[PDB]
Amino acid sequence: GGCSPHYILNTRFRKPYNVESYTPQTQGKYEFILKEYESYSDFERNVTEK
Amino acid sequence: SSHGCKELENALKAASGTQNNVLRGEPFIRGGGAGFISGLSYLELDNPA
Numbered sequence: 001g002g003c004s005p006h007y008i009l010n011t012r013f014r015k016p017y018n019v020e021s022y023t024p025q026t027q028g029k030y031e032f033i034l035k036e037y038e039s040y041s042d043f044e045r046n047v048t049e050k
Numbered sequence: 051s052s053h054g055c056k057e058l059e060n061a062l063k064a065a066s067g068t069q070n071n072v073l074r075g076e077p078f079i080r081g082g083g084a085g086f087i088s089g090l091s092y093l094e095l096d097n098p099a
C-alpha cells in the first residue's frame with residue numbers, strides 16, 4: 001500500500017515497504033590537526049695560529 | 051739578535067633553534083542542510099568561529 005507521503009524539504013517520498021524509516025538525521029563533524037616542528041643546530045669553530 | 055712572535059685565535063659559534071606550532075580544531079554541527087553543515091563546519095583558520 002504505502003502512499004503515506006514523507007516530506008524532506010519540499011520533496012515528498014514514498015517509503016518502500018521493506019524500510020522501517022529513512023530520515024534526514026543531518027549532522028557534520030570536521031576535525032583539523034596541524035603540527036609543525038622545526039629544529040636547527042649550527043656549530044662553527046675557527047682555530048688559527050701563526 | 052733573536053726574535054719570536056707567536057699568535058693564536060680560537061673562535062667558536064653555536065646556534066640552536068626549535069619551533070613547535072600545534073593547531074587543532076573541531077567544528078561540530080547537528081541540524082540544517084548538509085551543504086550548510088559542511089560549509090560552516092569547514093574550519094577557516096583566519097575566522098575559526
Ligand SMILES: *[C@@H]1O[C@H](CO)[C@@H](O[C@@H]2O[C@H](CO)[C@@H](O)[C@H](O)[C@H]2NC(C)=O)[C@H](O)[C@H]1NC(C)=O
Pocket residue numbers: 044045046061062063
Ligand atoms: C670562521 O671563518 C669563516 C671564514 O673566514 C668566517 O666566515 C666569514 O665571516 C665574515 C664575518 O661574518 C664574513 O664577512 C665573511 O664573508 C665570511 N666568509 C665566508 C666564506 O662565509 C666565519 O665567520 C668564522 N666563524 C667564526 C665563528 O668566527
